[PDB]
Amino acid sequence: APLFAGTEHRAIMVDSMLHTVYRLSRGRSLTKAQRDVIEDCLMALCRYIRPSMLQHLLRRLVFDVPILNEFAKMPLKLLTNHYERCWKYYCLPTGWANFGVTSEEELHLTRKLFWGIFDSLAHKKYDQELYRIAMPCLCAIAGALPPDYVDASYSSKTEKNFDPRPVETLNVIIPEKLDSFINKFAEYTHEKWAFDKIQNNWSYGENIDEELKTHPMLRPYKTFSEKDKEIYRWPIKESLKAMIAWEWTVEKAREGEYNPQPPDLSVVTLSRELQAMAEQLAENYHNTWGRKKKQELEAKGGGSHPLLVPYDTLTAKEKARDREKAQELLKFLQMNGYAVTRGLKDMELDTSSIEKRFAFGFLQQLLRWMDISQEFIAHLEAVVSSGRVEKSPHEQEIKFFAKILLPLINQYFTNHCLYFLSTPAKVLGSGGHASNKEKEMITSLFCKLAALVRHRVSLFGTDAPAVVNCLHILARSLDARTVMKSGPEIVKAGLRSFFESASEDIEKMVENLRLKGVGQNLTYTTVALLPVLTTLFQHIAQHQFGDDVILDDVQVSCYRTLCSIYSLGTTRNPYVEKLRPALGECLARLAAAMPVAFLEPELNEYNACSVYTTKSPRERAILGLPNSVEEMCPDIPVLERLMAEIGGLAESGARYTEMPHVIEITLPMLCSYLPRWWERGPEAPPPALPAGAPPPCTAVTSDHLNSLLGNILRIIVNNLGIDEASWMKRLAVFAQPIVSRARPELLRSHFIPTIGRLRKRAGKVVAEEEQLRLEAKAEAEEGELLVRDEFSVLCRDLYALYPLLIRYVDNNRAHWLTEPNPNAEELFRM
Amino acid sequence: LRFFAICGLQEGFEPFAINMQRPVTTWFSKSLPQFEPVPLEHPHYEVA
């Protein structure tokens, strides 16, 4: 098989081989081992043949696989591997290196394959093996399809062994006006064929033998024989009768207008409706032609027609042949005055390229299934409340939603995250950006999934992790800025309701924690809400969506969430002890994302994002908003008080047991609050300062960050050597971002003493190790574990402090090298 | 050099023209079309 790479020259023979092997695989009277061998051969061949050469096999699979019978198991795996290997060939605009780029026909076949498989699986009953084989195939096809691919042959009708059965042209009647056009177009087509004969250098003669280069039937229409005139007319009769049978009404507004004298047809250009006319008319030509070759297949007792595949499946180059003649007929109707009307089902959709994008339809289907999921979840809740009814009328829907949609969403919105986040101004991804409608649809999907899982984690059971992961992915793919700026009130209210419900659930969890609904809220908030809320806040902060998303009602909800998480700091329950890390991470992300300096209410007047500025005093009384941002909630100390408390504790030398809340909640929140407001307060790069702006709404300077970093280092130093301290790594990770603003004085003030202490401890432990070598057996065996534990705690302390030092070194190594520093040299020695 | 000391000097890298008595001669891609013999291995054009 590896030798088949680079066989573009023998493309016909390679295609024939692939078709033959596929037919053999679909063979009766074959043993299991034989079938396995054939399938292995097919997979090996497709693993090395260039993606461009597998187009005909893809065409056959597009017709065979959607059935999802027992013979579709191997085609599904073949397609999975093919698309997983050649996804670039289809997705990237440039294509795959040295292989080229996909064609419109290949992309159309891929989309048809995806949707056929999706529909068949949705309508099929649950089958573990079938679902396990089909989900990867759907994921691969979706990942290969470009998100914004628009199907040129998009057919809202999407009508339909193959059915070559055409319409009943012969039984349907033919108007006399259409018969007049039939005669005139028979004359025209004879003149066209005479012109073609002129191109071929074929004159009038006694026979059409090639060597004579003549045509026995080349004379004017008048002398044209009635038999041959009828022969020319008969195809025209059948075409027009097909049009009548379709209920296509033809109106003759005007009248129709040897040496060939065929009037030019290039003068008239087919409209979109006339192009669809010709599309279906040529499709019927192909269907009649198919009925014929079916007749010779029946006569032969076997065989299959190579071009039996429908027109849409057929490559455009093959279409072009009958394309020319069909469009000729329609155009001649037009300039003969015959305008044919159908009432196209795609006219209502006109062009709507955005609605024709693949991602648009995918999201539409996902939202419809979100509604279906709401229905069956409500039914499940009702039955588990009253009446032990196990019929499960939506069991198939449940299995589909949990086994196909969730993994499909997980992979698709993981792969195409950049497409949904890019905007016309900034193109984050390779090429193409999601439309506002697509962004709104993905936001609606996220909100609907969150509402579905709300207080219903147990209902999903083992699929709850999948739901939570999908929520994470959607939140990281959410374009909240654009959705909130220019979006429907429905989707905006959906996002606002998500935030409001999150705040309410957090409040209930906090009050319960400080002391079946209790269990429901606790498990839900711990498993789904807090992780998802943290992810959403982190995404907003990273993409700078805070100033555009967290306003008005969202700002109030975030205020409540923050002011409750912080209020959860005056208790000591074991439950609080276990849940503190997650609350601290959530609060840190919220502080990063918040557009209002909630620790500096005194300067809130200079903030254009604060609700007290966005909403007039007449508003904010319609709601329950206090009179002042200070009273928003007064349980969070101001920045000065918090810094003073942290510094006092650090100097006092307290331990984590004495400061559980400050180390796990307050400090992580400050490590995100200070960096955000340093960029918007005094001492920040003023490129926009010349533009008329008010004084900064914050007083954060590099001094604040330096003091916080020093305090964190002092706290870690104070807690050095403790047997158990897992908070050290979290604190170091949270403090890493604020190290870029550390002052040069920090080296000598904090780092040198800390690393000196660590070096002294390491020396002591190594001395104990050497004395252990001096010891013997029982003396050696014991004490070995003691020095092991000492080294373990030393390694914990080092992995807590060194990452902070590395960032500090990177930001000062240039200065140290430019100007030699004895303190830097001492640090090197340590 | 403005950043050699910060990165490269201690790593042991040497300036490209450190001990050259004359500036290094340079060539540029001049966009003036010129007639040249058809390459014997040209991927598209062959002369017999």
Distance CA A550, CA A496 (A): 9
Residues in B closer than 8 angstroms to A814, CB to CB, are 6
DSSP string, A792-817: HHHHHHHHHHHHHHHHHHHHHHHHHH
DSSP string, A24-35: HHT-SS--HHHH
Distance CA A115, CA A118 (A): 5
**CA-closest candidate to residue A447, choices A396, A402, A481, A490:** A490
The DSSP letter of residue A254 is S
At A250, is the secondary structure helix, strand, or coil?
strand
Distance CA A627, CA A282 (A): 73
**CA-closest candidate to residue A569, choices A499, A668, A713:** A668
- The two beta strands, A203-204 and A249-252, are unpaired
List the beta bridge partners of residue A249.
A341
The DSSP letter of residue B13 is -
**Cα separations in angstroms, A625 against A508, A559, A602:** 20, 11, 17
Does B10 contact chain A (CB < 8 Å)?
yes
At A357, is the secondary structure helix, strand, or coil?
strand
Distance CA A455, CA A386 (A): 18
Contact A550, A540 (CB under 8 A): yes
Distance CA A172, CA A240 (A): 10
Two structure tokens written together for A265: 């047809």
Two structure tokens written together for A702: 């590099």
Q: Which amino acid is at A209?
A: D
Contact A705, A746 (CB under 8 A): no
* Residue A88 buriedness (CB in 10 A; 0-12 / 13-18 / 19+): middle
Two structure tokens written together for A16: 């024939």
Element housing A341 (H / E): strand A338-341
After which residues does chain B break, using C–N > 2.5 Å?
Answer: none
At A819, is the secondary structure helix, strand, or coil?
coil
Distance CA A522, CA A520 (A): 6
Cα three-residue angle A758-A763-A769, rounded to 5 degrees: 125
Residues in B closer than 8 angstroms to A825, CB to CB, are none
Distance CA A45, CA A42 (A): 5
Distance CA A366, CA A783 (A): 62
Instruction: Give the minimum alpha-carbon distance from B4 to chain A in angstroms, rounded to a whole number.
Output: 10
Contact A77, A42 (CB under 8 A): no
How many C-beta neighbours within 10 Å does residue A707 have?
18
List the beta bridge partners of residue A204.
A215
**CA-closest candidate to residue A285, choices A340, A330, A228:** A330
Number of inter-chain CB pairs under 8 A, A vs B: 7
Distance CA A24, CA A18 (A): 10
**Cα separations in angstroms, A439 against A46, A341, A356, A481:** 37, 37, 15, 10
Distance CA A108, CA A114 (A): 10
**CA-closest candidate to residue A153, choices A64, A284, A306, A278:** A278
* 8 Å CB contact of A813 and B6: yes
**Cα separations in angstroms, A573 against A123, A488, A569, A663:** 51, 44, 10, 16
Distance CA A638, CA A646 (A): 12
**Cα separations in angstroms, A78 against A113, A314, A477, A536:** 13, 21, 30, 38
Method: cryo-EM
Two structure tokens written together for A470: 């999908």
The DSSP letter of residue A739 is G
Torsion-angle region of residue A592: left (phi > 0), alpha (psi -120 to 50) or beta?
alpha
Distance CA A428, CA A418 (A): 6
Residues in A closer than 8 angstroms to B10, CB to CB, are 817
Does B6 contact chain A (CB < 8 Å)?
yes
Contact A599, A638 (CB under 8 A): yes
List the beta bridge partners of residue A341.
A249
Element housing A17 (H / E): helix A11-25
Closest-CA residue of A relative to B3 is A814
Backbone CA torsion sign across A517, A519, A525, A528: negative
* 8 Å CB contact of A818 and B5: yes
Q: Which amino acid is at A233?
A: R
* 8 Å CB contact of B5 and A813: no
Packed helices A702-718 and A727-735: angle between N→C axes, nearest 10 degrees: 160
At A659, is the secondary structure helix, strand, or coil?
coil
Distance CA A594, CA A674 (A): 12
Distance CA A544, CA A481 (A): 9
Distance CA A407, CA A149 (A): 22
**CA-closest candidate to residue A577, choices A729, A799, A727, A733:** A727
Distance CA A509, CA A518 (A): 8
Name the CA dihedral angle for A432, A436, A438, A443, rounded to a multiple of 10 degrees: 130
Question: At a CB cut-off of 8 Å and minimum separation 6, what does A94 contact?
Answer: A101
Does B34 contact chain A (CB < 8 Å)?
no
Packed helices A639-652 and A667-678: angle between N→C axes, nearest 10 degrees: 130
The DSSP letter of residue A52 is G
Distance CA A178, CA A244 (A): 10
Two structure tokens written together for A766: 């190594």
**Cα separations in angstroms, A499 against A377, A492, A623, A641, A672:** 22, 11, 16, 29, 21
Widest Cα–Cα separation across chain A: 124
Two structure tokens written together for A295: 């007749």
At which residue do the structure tokens 């918007």 appear?
Answer: A680
HEC sequence for A171-222: CCCCCHHHHHHHHHHHHHHHHHHHHHHHHCCCEECCCCCCCCCEECCCCCCC
HEC sequence for A420-457: HHCCCCCCCCCCCCCCHHHHHHHHHHHHHHHHHHCCCH
Distance CA B30, CA B28 (A): 6
Cα R_g (chain B), whole angstroms: 21
Cα three-residue angle A670-A676-A682, rounded to 5 degrees: 105
Widest Cα–Cα separation across chain B: 59
Q: How many residues does chain A have?
A: 830
DSSP string, A611-651: HHHHS-TTTTSSS---SSHHHH-TTS--HHHHHHHHHHHHH
Closest-CA residue of B relative to A815 is B6
**CA-closest candidate to residue A49, choices A73, A13, A95, A25:** A13
The pair phi, psi for residue A337, each rounded to 5°, is 100, 0
HEC sequence for A139-170: HHHHHHCCCCCECCCCCCCCCCCCCCCCCCCC
Instruction: Give the minimum alpha-carbon distance from A817 to chain B in angstroms, rounded to a whole number.
Output: 6
Two structure tokens written together for A477: 């793919």
Distance CA A172, CA A185 (A): 20
Query: What is the C-alpha end-to-end distance of chain A, expressed in Å?
Result: 61
Question: At a CB cut-off of 8 Å and minimum separation 6, what does A323 contact?
Answer: A278, A282
**CA-closest candidate to residue A594, choices A535, A529, A676:** A676
Instruction: Give the minimum alpha-carbon distance from A825 to chain B in angstroms, rounded to a whole number.
Output: 15
Residues in A closer than 8 angstroms to B6, CB to CB, are 813-814, 817-818
List the beta bridge partners of residue A215.
A204
Distance CA A715, CA A711 (A): 6
At which residue do the structure tokens 């057996």 appear?
Answer: A777
The DSSP letter of residue B8 is T
After which residues does chain A break, using C–N > 2.5 Å?
Answer: 160, 257, 515
Closest-CA residue of B relative to A817 is B6
Question: At a CB cut-off of 8 Å and minimum separation 6, what does A602 contact?
Answer: A630, A638
Contact A87, A42 (CB under 8 A): no
Give the rounded distance of the alpha carbon of A768 from its chain centre: 57
DSSP string, A65-113: GGG--GGGHHHHHHHHHHHHHSHHHHHSSS-BTTTB---HHHHHHHHHH
Closest-CA residue of B relative to A812 is B6
Instruction: Give the minimum alpha-carbon distance from A8 to chain B in angstroms, rounded to a whole number.
Output: 17
Residues in B closer than 8 angstroms to A813, CB to CB, are 6
Distance CA A530, CA A184 (A): 76
Element housing A339 (H / E): strand A338-341
Two structure tokens written together for A438: 């697509």
Give the rounded distance of the alpha carbon of A598 from its chain centre: 35
Interface test with B, best of A98, A810, A815, A817 (most B CBs within 10 A): A817
Distance CA A634, CA A207 (A): 105
Element housing A788 (H / E): helix A777-818
Closest-CA residue of A relative to B7 is A814
Distance CA A592, CA A586 (A): 10
Backbone CA torsion sign across A387, A393, A397, A402: positive
DSSP string, A698-738: ----HHHHHHHHHHHHHHHHHTTT-S--SHHHHHHHHHGGG
